[PDB]
Each structure stands twice: as structure tokens, then as C-alpha cells.
Design a binder for these strands. Structure first.
Lengths: 281, 270, 242, 282
RNA sequence: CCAUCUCUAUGUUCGCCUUAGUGCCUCAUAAACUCCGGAAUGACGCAGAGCCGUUUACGGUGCUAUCGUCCACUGUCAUCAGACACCUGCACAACGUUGAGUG
């Protein structure tokens, strides 16, 4: 079935996280090179007990050895990279509140410096990290609840990006996530010679390019979304949906919509574009 | 170009009008008593971007004969609009007290020669900052004479989405105050509630980042005599999370903007 | 040296002394983790429960037979069921936490190879330079550089012990960084001091105000020493109210 | 006369500092072009005021040699000093947000997130030039105002004096000290009666002292500790600072450690003084 | 909402306790040992003034994959049809109701 791994600089609540995983029901352990230990945790796999592990300065290995252990993987349990982290100031505060002894800086380093040295040694495993959830602002009560759910959803499904334009005359869809209007932008019914020519039309699309100013918004919007996009990825939405609102498909400038479905698609997104209003009712 | 000046009695919030300058995009500088302000006007002429400036009593130059020398030094590249504003004296008497009106009254006399040179004199005690500003917008910036009422709504998805609007924004990604069982019944309008949210840094990040966007298309939206405009925000439970966000966006417009409303339709029920 | 193990707190306690430790080690993994441990050459302990325990303790007996003696095993084992066989019988020790608690546990000092050969006292002290420094002490520490509540008059009246006051302090990280390093300093020489006939040992902390800005510091220092287990009582010299 | 300049990370809330200067009485000008600054100093010369100004991030030179060339244009009779003020990105944003409105440039150029990040570069020249770097990372809007009162004579703090003063537990402890550490943990080679009459500053004993490398390791961690908040102590302007190490006999033990410490600052470059009072004769 | 007292950054001075060890016919290791004055402000305090009636018993699922496809028109309040998902005792103290209690 599955292998889970935890990581992050203290304050990550990697121990608060380990609580959540037995609550999850995965197997629970503290610290070891355990390079050949997952073969014997394969005994855990014989018992059908999905697994969970944590890594820290205490469980620190050689990056070569960290990935040598990734190499020594019984595939039956598939490790799922989960790391957490936050700004030095807070992590420090949190560790401090704990009487947890230390980052074990035998070098007699200070703690703030220790926080810095730590990110370096946690850098090889934090670059291999796959799910990264910051803990910077959550008190012990707030960390656990968010964690319960995020961990709980555990959805493999990625996000099918959906772009859509419509006509308010019929109205605004019911299934989108974000609702934008651009009636203010140039009109296709304007130059009614082009009014029949849909917005998708290439020469009409040449008239769309004219307004690089509109293209400002294209970029602006493009970015606006980008900002929350990473944020969005963690949740179990199977698909992200967005609605663009015009009076008709002509003004839809689904070109733009498709240039944003193509711009996000250039970024590498799963655009599953739709122009439902264009299609027959 | 357009050149502003600001003057008035101490405690009249000339600074508020200097802050109002930047809302209209104007560069400004604090406490410039120099008559090389014209030299400053060259630097601003090289920029060629309209700006503004004010006059403290420190700026009061003992010789207003020197004040007209400066305006003579001031070039064609800019045009001086004399703004003078003394609030109800009681308001002025009331205003100074925070974290008499006679020692101050002396300096009003000192400002009396330039207020005679003032294009206008305006009591700001009653005019709301946004309203007086719009007045200052319609007086100097010729703010268009149309009335685009602004509306802000907070709702929940399960109850649907109010049709009467141009904009909607989910916030489910923003951190939820419901994690706390004590504040789960606590409504969004509640101040303890405000706290969980305010503490969440990112929240504040969506607040103005988001506000930014609205502004980006706001001048483009003003035209077309939009009789009205509405924007809404939604939460899985519109009762708590979305309220502070829509309310936070609403205060920006109350101030920077004008004709904004607050509509928690989700809880408007009974 | 090696050991075999509110059992979690106890585990916390073993590494607080200095024991590298680990939780939930399957039995066959112990002789193998005693090879890794041999790399460490440091005293060790591990906590094992029923979920980890095998249906047959023959695996445990075989592991104890295969256990590297280079590391000397030690065994330990409850509470009243209101407050809550084959190898708990093998446990040389059996201890009850039904009413026994953290300082009482800090038992482990006598249970540890260490034993009470002498008594040592931790008496933590707060004072202001305005009346004068302590009549006598061992260590002294200005704390003025730390953020000061005097800034906010809201708390100006309230002393440090006051929780509202504690709060102003808590947000300030430097405090935590200052409180953390300091603890350590004392940790470093505490053993040598411990290895002495010194009857008592009194640190003292000074903020000019002499109340709000320092007592808390020493109260946080007093609660860390109490968690460690060392006898700890404090005297606000300014607040004796004489 | 005196001259002052303030700047820092946008969100430093440097604005309150203006009010702080205005409460002191300094003539406060804001967002002034750098080109106009030197003339400003000249007109201020007969103004007879300790000059004060704030450097807007908006006042970004786009010419670092020219920016250095205006700071150099500075005329006489006015004494410059640079104030910096920064804090955490996270802390700043909330504060920035508190700015009801602001445009850190980033107009069709960036989102707030990295305006401060590029600012770091824009301010790097300023931060280099900085003379009194400060942070408001935690001061709340109400508690920061009171922090501003910290301003005090650069002349008094101008003294970096710090002292290492031996004393004798037998006789007592000094009335003057901020850090006092008993340190009677390290061995007493003085217990050896042959070594007992070795001097308070005996040079031969240093081998016995070296023999207790664990006593010399002590020093390492001791330093390590001391330096942690030494910059924080710099703020006080306590014209001098005081650190005392005592021993019942006194110098036969303490005089050696301090010596090393003083040296440790005869290399770092700190004004250290070593007066062994225990080594005092009626 | 109190003049006007009193308490709330920096720098100046203040001696002895027979316990352990290097005399000399009386000066040495560990334990026991406590006091003020000179230049910021806040807190109170008795110079105005001001007076909300004071209040303090108990009630709310709000936790999250399709979809409600006329809003009808011709210049909309459809939540309401649900898949149903289940529910750590200072941040940490609401908004309704209610004790209790004068303006």
C-alpha cells in the first residue's frame, strides 16, 4: 500500500505530525538510518499496516546515503514526501516553548545559527520534498486540525484546469470557482461587421491583440491567479474551474480565455478548456 | 502641468489631504518651506508627472514678499492651484487632543495672506474624507459627474450565489477561523474572530493583493455610466470566514473610494 | 551502558539526562540497531508496547540472547487503572505513576547509575538595581537589552507574575533566544557544581525596574529547572513586601 | 552642529520615527529628492537646527555613484549620521497592509511580496552606509512608538568601553557589574601549596591552567555566550560596560581568564580594560 | 476628568559574622551573613467638569464530490432536489435570549 515520510526544521511540529499519523493509523517510529529497516517494515506490509516515518537532525544521515536509502526501497509501500517549515523567528519560538533539548550542535553553535545550518542539511531532503506545508502561523491547536484534514484527504488526483466563457444573457455558470467580467473591454458587436464574426475568429483575434492594454489584464489576471494557484493545489478539488463573463460568445474573447488556458498550459497545467455557451444548449 | 499647494490651520489634517494627493497619484513631500521649490519644480518637470506639496507654519516664510517671488520663479511647466482649508474652530479645538486655539489663532493670522491668495477656503470639519476628497476630486481633478454606487457582499455557497453582481471570489484557500471550536459559533463580524484572521498573515496578503486587482480595472469600469457595481466573496460557511474579507475590502472603498456598501446577505436572514 | 523501556515522558527523561533513545523498535531490529548504536558508543533506551510487542516473546528472548553485550541491557516496567505479562515480569523494575508525577519521576535520578551522594539547591532570584543587587548570589545577568514592558503603560503597574504581563514578553523572540542560551550556560557547569559540597546554588536576575522585566525571566528559568526535577524555589527580593 | 537621516525597509513604519523626531523638535522633511538635499543643508545652516530627513524608497537614485556623490556634497556645520530600520518580510507585510494604501512602485511591475525583496538590494547601499541599524520586528503600533524613545547621545555610546575586573569572593563582589560569573568550577592548581604562592597574574602557572584545557574550553563557551547580546548592550550608551569575574582568593584564578578575554578583543577590536581590583594594596 | 503631593533613563558614594591549614608570640580554606542619597515619565492622588441606570444567568449542523438547467425576458431572491462528510479542556471572548439588578 503506502509509505509516508515527515521532515522540516523543529517547529515543523514533526512530533505533532506523528500524532496525526497514528490518528491516521499509519505505523509510527522516531529515528534511524533504517536503510534496510523498510524491508523489515515490509513485515508491516505483510500485516497490511500502511507506514509513516520522520527525519530530523537526530535522524540526519550524507545526502548520497539519504538517497541510497530512497534507492533501497521495497516499492510495496510507496514513500510520499511530506515536509513542513516556517520563518526562523517562529520556529525558534516554538522550539523554545518546548524544553526539547537542542539541534544537538556539539559545535556549541547558537540556536539561530543552528536554524540556518539546519536548512542546508535539510536542503537535500527538502528539494526531494513533494508536499511542503508551512506551519508558520498555526498554534498547537491550529496545526493539528489543518493537518488532520489535509493529511486525511490524501487525494492522488491532480487539478484539471478549467477555463470557460459565457453570456450573462443565459447567465453565469453554477460550477465555476471565480467569476470575471470584461464588458468594459472592446466590443465585437462594436464594428457590427465583426459582430457575427465570433470572438474566436482569427481576424477578430487580430483585433483582440490590438488592445495589448487588454493583454495587460490578460497578463495581470494570468498572474493574479498564479498567486493563489500553488495555494490551491493542496486541497482535494479534483479540478479547478474558472468562469469568464461576457454578454455573448462573440465578446467571450475565449481567445484570451484560451490564451490563459494556453499560458497556464505553457506553464504545464491540465487545461480542459470549455466554451459551453458557444456549444448548442 | 497641474501643481497643487496645501495650507490651513494646525490640526486641519492637511496631511490627510497630502495622503489624498497620492490617492490621485500625486507625488508629494513633507514640510518644504524652500523657495527652491521651483528648483524642485524642475526636477518634477524632468519627471513631468503632476504632484503636490503643502505648507507648514515652518513653511510660512516670514516674508510673503518672498512667497510671490517663488510663484514668479515657478514655470509654465506647472500651474499653481491654491488650496486653503480651515475647519470649524471648535472642530480645530477638538481635533488636536489624541495620543489654546489662540496661540494657534496667531498662526492662522500668519496664513491669512496666502489664504487671500487661495483659490478657495473650505471647512473640512463636516466634509467626510472621501466626500471632501471627491469634492476636491470634482474641483481640481474634474472627477467625472457620474454616480457608480459600489456594493460588497459576503455569502455562502450552499445558500447559492447572489446573481446581482459582476464579481465573486472564493476564499476557501484562506485559513478558516472554524478550526477553533470556541469561535465556531462566533460570527464573522465578531472581533475575536477578526483576530484569528488578522493574525493569519497570508489573509492580509489576499486582502490588498486582491484589492489591487479591483483597482486595476476600476477606472475602466467607471465609464459606461455603470448605475451600480457589486462584488461578492463566498465561504463554504459564508457566516464567518468570508465576512471579514468582504468587510476588509469594503473599508478601503469607504475611504479611498466612495458609495461602497456592506451586505452579509448570508446572515441577513431574519 | 544500555536500557530497555506516561512512558513517553519517561522516554523524554532518558535523553534529557543524555541517552540517545528511540521509540517503537521491532524486536529483530534491536541487535541490528545495537550495531548502529555501537557506532555511537552512547547509552541508549527504547520504549516498546503491545502493538510493537510480538505474539511470541521467544523473539524478544532470542534478541536479548543476540543483543550486543558491548551495551549492558537494563530492564524497566504502570499506574492505577483509573489513572491509566511475559516480559513485564522480565522487567527488573516496576514503577507506579498513579499519583507520582514529573518531578517525582525526575526517581530516575536514583534509578539512573547516579545516586544521591549530596544535596544541591536551586534558588532563583529576581531583583532591581534601584534598591541594590542581591545581598549574596552565585551568577548575575543584566537583562536590560531585552524588550521592556515599561514601553506599554497598560502593564506598567502589573508585575511580571501577572499573566497579562507575561504575554507582552512571550511574543518577543529574542527573549526566547536569550532564555534558551542562558539555560544552557548553567547546564554546562551544573554537573561540576553538582560534584561539590556546595550546599545551595543561587542564580539571580536583574532588571533595573526590578519586577516586571526580570521575574518572568527567572519564572521561565524556574519552570525549566522544575521540569528537569532539581529542587527550585524563587524569591522576588523587590516583592518580599517588607 | 548635528545632522540626522532615517531610512529602512518599507514597512519599517519609519513614519512614526518622523513624529519621534518632531517630538524632539528636529526639522522633518519627507520624500525630498536627493539632488535637493545638499542645498537643503545650506538653507538649514542658518536655520540653526539639528538637521533631520527621511529617505523614501521612492527616492531611489538609479545612480549609486551619483547617490554617493550627493551624500558627499554634504556641506559643513552639519554632522551626518545614518539610521536604518528593518524587520521580517512577514512582519513588514502585515504592517504594509496596515498602510491603508501604498504602491511600492510594482505598478504593472510586481506584487507586494517581492517589492521589499528588491528593496533589499535598493537599500543594500543604504544599509552599508547605515550607522544605527534598528528593527521593529515585534513592537506593536502602540509599543513601537515608545521604543522610538530609545534615541540617545551617539557621543556617550561613542565610548565602546567594556571592562574585565577581577575581584575576591572572600572580600565580596563589586558594586559595579552587569555580568558576574562565579567560575570556581575549574580546578585550583592553587590547591597545590607549591603552586599556591604562584602570582595572581603568574605567567608560569599558565601551563597548569593550560593543563586544565577543560578550563580553557570553558573560556570558549564563555566568549560564545558573551558575544550573543554584545550588539544589544551597544544600544545602552552606558558610557562603559562592566563585567566582573571573582574567586575567593581572586587573581590567582580569575586574572588568567580575563586576560584571554581582553586579548580576544585586542584582536576583534573592542575597547576592553582590565583592572584587577583584588590586586589592589591599601 | 485633578494643579499640587507621593510612589514610576544614566551616574556618584557605605565592613565583618570566632566555620579549615601554611606566622609569630594570632592570618590562610568552606559555610553562615544586610543599609541610601542627586536631573524621566506613568500610576494614583482632590481644581473644574462630566453621569450611560449598574448589568453578567443560558441558546445556535455550520465541518466539506453533480447540481438545482423558465426566471421567465424579450430595453431573477429558485436556499427548497441532495453525494453526504463527520462533530485538546492564555489566541480563547461574541451576537441573540435570560437571570439578577433603577434612571
Amino acid at each position: 500500500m503506502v509509505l509516508m515520510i515527515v521532515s522540516g526544521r523543529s517547529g515543523s511540529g514533526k512530533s505533532v505530525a506523528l500524532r496525526a499519523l497514528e490518528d491516521m493509523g499509519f505505523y509510527c517510529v522516531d529515528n534511524l538510518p533504517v536503510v534496510l529497516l523498510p524491508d523489515l517494515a515490509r513485515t508491516l506490509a505483510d500485516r497490511e499496516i500502511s507506514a509513516a516515518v520522520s527525519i530530523d537532525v537526530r535522524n540526519m544521515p550524507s545526502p548520497e546515503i539519504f538517497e541510497q536509502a530512497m534507492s533501497n526501497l521495497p516499492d510495496a509501500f510507496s514513500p510520499q514526501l511530506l515536509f513542513l517549515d516556517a520563518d526562523r523567528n517562529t520556529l525558534i519560538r516554538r522550539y523554545s516553548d518546548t524544553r526539547r533539548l537542542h539541534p544537538l550542535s556539539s559545535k556549541n553553535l547558537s540556536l539561530e545559527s543552528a536554524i540556518d545550518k539546519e536548512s542546508d542539511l535539510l536542503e537535500p531532503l527538502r528539494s526531494r520534498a513533494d508536499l511542503i506545508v508551512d506551519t508558520s502561523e498555526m498554534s498547537v491547536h491550529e496545526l493539528a486540525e489543518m493537518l488532520r484534514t489535509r493529511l486525511l484527504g490524501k487525494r492522488e488526483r491532480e487539478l484539471t484546469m478549467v477555463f470557460e466563457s459565457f453570456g450573462f444573457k443565459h447567465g453565469i455558470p453554477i460550477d465555476a470557482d471565480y467569476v470575471f467580467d470584461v464588458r468594459f473591454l472592446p466590443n465585437p458587436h462594436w464594428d457590427p461587421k465583426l459582430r457575427p464574426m465570433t470572438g474566436l475568429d482569427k481576424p477578430v483575434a487580430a483585433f483582440l491583440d490590438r488592445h495589448t492594454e487588454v493583454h495587460n489584464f490578460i497578463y495581470q489576471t494570468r498572474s493574479y491567479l498564479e498567486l493563489w494557484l500553488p495555494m490551491l493545489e493542496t486541497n482535494n478539488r479534483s479540478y479547478l474551474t474558472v468562469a469568464i463573463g461576457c454578454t455573448g460568445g462573440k465578446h467571450r474573447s475565449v481567445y484570451i480565455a484560451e490564451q490563459l488556458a494556453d499560458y497556464f498550459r505553457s506553464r504545464g497545467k491540465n487545461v480542459q478548456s470549455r466554451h459551453r455557451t458557444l456549444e448548442k444548449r
